[PDB]
Structure 1
Amino acid sequence: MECPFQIQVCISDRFFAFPHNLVEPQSDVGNKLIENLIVYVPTDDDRLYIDKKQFPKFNSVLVYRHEHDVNIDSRSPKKTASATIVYWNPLVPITEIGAGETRVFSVLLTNNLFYCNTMIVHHENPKCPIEFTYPNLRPIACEIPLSHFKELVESNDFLLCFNLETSTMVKILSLKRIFCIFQYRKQPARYVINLPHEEIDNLYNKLNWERTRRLMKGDVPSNCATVNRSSLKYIKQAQSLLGIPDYSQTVVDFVKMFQKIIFPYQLVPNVIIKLNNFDQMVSSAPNKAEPYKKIRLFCKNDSIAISSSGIVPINMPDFSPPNTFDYSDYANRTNINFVTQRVLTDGGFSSGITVTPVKYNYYL
């Protein structure tokens, strides 16, 4: 699909609250101002927060829950300039448009909104929040924003839920809103969620797609994100095998700890290697068995880079097809075998020994 001509998208996380100010009465050519205005929302609940008094510009304002019709379904929606129309955080494609250019103000780029005239007015929120799981707690209703308003200012320990019927779209939407408001918050509060969560990891993958979609036009934020199960358990094991001064210690802790030492050894930590290894997709990717995603790692002013596989000269395909090859006069099977026999003899070892000659890329 695409956005029909004469419609525009404004993203702002602030639109998680209704931006009563911004909208202005549309008018047709000939200055035919249309003070009749109608607005559409995910639920009747949305209406309860929205105030007619904010719009003296208009004499006539109405609001309804959107519903996805059938018969009007068209790439080109029906037109009715006789009323201004607005959709606020709409979920699904709209079949009808108001006066002049219609505009939508939404937090989230749906796939429907891809091929579209879009603006973001974005800003970085530096503060990454966090999850935590213990298995005191604030019970936060999993949908209603302002039911717990100012509680989300006061506390940092937020329990979440959902009802069985909930549309996954609604789930994503609410989670997005919560994360935006958290990134506005001044301290990293802790998520806790009472759900089987496998589908939540699926929805996280969706979020990854979404964030990429944004980044197609985005602010290139350093937004924090993590694999949430494979990684999770692995790092847990890592800590367990180490001393555990804080079982609650954030991964980024260990990350930066290794950062302290990477450059002096000019070679890649196994932690980071297993990262981008055991993600389903953004890794060696068991999704498609793609270790080919070797990391080329560079630092300021370097004449050289660190590949997955040793030092490399800059901006070149990771390994020369020609080389000072591993000439078979070394790595002759026979020699390897003889050495192996020697070794096994000496060790008195019956089993479990294998050896392989080393190999070299651009540099030795």
Structure 2
Amino acid sequence: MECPFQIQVCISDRFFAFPHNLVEPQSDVGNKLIENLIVYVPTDDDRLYIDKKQFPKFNSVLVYRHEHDVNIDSRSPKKTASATIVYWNPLVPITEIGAGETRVFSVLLTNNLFYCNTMIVHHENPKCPIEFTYPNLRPIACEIPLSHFKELVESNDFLLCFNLETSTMVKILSLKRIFCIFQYRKQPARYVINLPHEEIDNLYNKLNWERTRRLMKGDVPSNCATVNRSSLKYIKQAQSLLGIPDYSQTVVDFVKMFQKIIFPYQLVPNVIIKLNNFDQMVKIRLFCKNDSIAISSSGIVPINMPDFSPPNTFDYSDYANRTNINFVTQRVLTDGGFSSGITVTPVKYNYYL
């Protein structure tokens, strides 16, 4: 994928609402500013949230729904020197560009904009929402969050709904905008997405890839992540086994519970191990400030060393042999009076014992 340098993209959670102030007329080759402005939006309804009166710099303002023009190759979009072109949360390739630099504002960072040369990323202090999967909720038409803006900034229990024929990209953009609104909420808000589990998982995967793109473009890390459905099911099983009411315990706190074990016992909690495995299907390593070693799923590892020590570091032949293994297994079977379900494995060792 290639992008034309004439497009400049700014990424900011704030862009869930259109940045009227940031728009500015572009100049032609003759350095003549263009008083005509064209704003592109992903859906027709978006037009209602563009206030033409907020563009004093321009004399004429028009708004249209950006639509993939199959007749134009995005590698070289047509230019329209007669107007300044701005795209808001584009979901399809930009086939048209304005005078000077075509401006783009987006809360999402799809591949289309990923290769865009000029990338301005606004940084925010993270503020995470609460996943509240559960069958007094406040329904929210995700396609039009700004309509529910007041409720989104006031209440704390939202049922996220979508029109049947809503497109996947529209869903992704709506979710991103809602999550930005929550990022600006002082109080985290619980929400439930009225969608099939697989669809929600795919949406979360795409959002994760978008966040990865933002990081690669220089965005600040945010702990406000999301959990795949299998991971949520595992966490729920763990909480139930421990006798923890699901509504009472949040996943984040549940995981944090084992930070007391992480360092002092120099062990990786099994919950974190399982979550990492789920993400992999969709290894671990960490340390402490000034620490000389790293705790990993494999055990202790010298800092900056590979996750596994050289193969010949330790000789296990003494016990890592069929004779010893069979002897121990037979002893166990005899002592316990067992006949099946018994399995003994030699213990290997990483860098350290």
With the shorter chain as reference, the TM-score category is over 0.9
Closer, same or farther in 2 for the Cα pair 1:349/1:37, shift >3 Å? closer
| Deviation for aligned residue 1:246 | 5.2
* 2:6–2:97 contact (8 Å) kept in structure 1: no
Q: Please report how far the alpha carbon of residue 234 of structure 1 lies from its aligned counterpart in structure 2 after TM superposition.
A: 0.8
- How far apart, CA to CA, are the structure 2 residues paired with 1:64 and 1:154? 31
For residues 339 and 109 of structure 1, do their structure 2 counterparts lie closer, same or farther at Cα, with a shift above 3 Å needed? closer
- Helix, strand or coil: the match of 1:323? helix
Greater Cα shift, 330-339 or 184-193: 330-339
User: Could you report, residue by residue, the CA deviation over 1:154-180 in whole angstroms, capped at 9, with x for unpaired residues?
Assistant: 210111211111110000011100000
| Higher mean C-alpha displacement, 241-250 vs 89-98 | 241-250
SS in 1 for 2:278: coil
Deviation for aligned residue 1:39 = 2.1
- 8 A contact 1:323–1:362 mirrored in 2: no
Whether 1:342 aligns to 2:345 is: no
- Give 1:245 shift: 4.8
Residue 161 (1) aligns with residue 161 (2): yes
SS in 1 for 2:105: strand
Q: Percent same amino acid at aligned positions?
A: 100
- Return closer, same or farther for 1:303/1:138 CA change in 2, 3 Å cut-off: same
Equivalent position SS for 2:121: coil
Root-mean-square deviation (Å): 2.1
CA contact (8 A) 1:231 1:275 kept: yes
Distance 1:217 1:74, change over 3 A: closer
Structure 1 position 121, deviation (Å): 4.4
Distance 1:108 1:246, change over 3 A: closer
**CA distance in structure 2 between the aligned counterparts of 1:340 and 1:251, rounded to whole angstroms:** 40
Equivalents in 2 of 1:123, 1:316: separation in Å? 33
CA contact (8 A) 1:86 1:103 kept: yes
Q: Determine the C-alpha separation between the residues in 2 that align with 1:221 and 1:109.
A: 15
Q: 1:23 to 1:226 in 2, by over 3 A?
A: closer
For residues 222 and 16 of structure 2, what CA distance do their matches in structure 1 show? 21
Is the alpha carbon distance of 1:30 and 1:276 closer, same or farther for their aligned partners in structure 2, counting shifts above 3 Å?
Answer: same
Mean Cα deviation higher: 68-77 or 202-211: 68-77
Q: Deviations over 1:332-361 (max 9, x none)?
A: 422433343333233322222221222222
Pair 263,165 (structure 1): closer, same or farther in 2 beyond 3 Å:
same
In the alignment, is the contact (CA less than 8 A) between 1:140 and 1:159 conserved in 2?
A: yes
TM-score under structure 1 length normalisation:
0.90
Name the CA shift for 1:63/1:311 in 2 (closer, same or farther; >3 Å): closer
Closer, same or farther: CA 362–33 of 1 in aligned 2, 3 Å: closer
Residue 8 of structure 1 deviates from its aligned partner by 0.8
Q: Give the aligned length.
A: 353
Larger radius of gyration: 1
1:323–1:361 Cα contact (<8 Å) kept: no
Pairing 1:151–2:151 present: yes
Change (3 A) 1:346 1:122: same
Q: Do 1:156 and 1:188's aligned partners in 2 also have CA atoms closer than 8 Å?
A: yes
Q: Decide whether aligned partners of structure 1 residues 298 and 349 sit closer, same or farther in structure 2, where only a CA change above 3 A counts.
A: same
Aligned-pair CA distance for 1:240: 0.9
- 1:240–1:73 CA distance, 2 compared to 1 (3 A): same
- Shift, 1:329, TM fit: 3.6
**Structure 1 pair 66–246 and aligned structure 2 pair: CA distance change class (3 A):** closer
Which shows bigger deviation, 326-335 or 180-189? 326-335
Residue number in structure 2 paired with 1:322: 311
The answer (yes or no) to whether the contact 1:37–1:58 under 8 Å persists in 2 is yes
Where 2:276 maps in the other structure, the secondary structure is coil
State the partner residue of 1:57. 57
Consecutive unaligned residues in structure 1, runs of 5 or more: 283-293
- Give CA-to-partner distance per residue, 1:213-266, whole Å, 9 cap, x none: 111113322232232311111111111111225544112212222102221111
**TM superposition outliers: structure 1 runs of 4+ over 6 Å:** none
SS of match in other structure, 1:252: helix
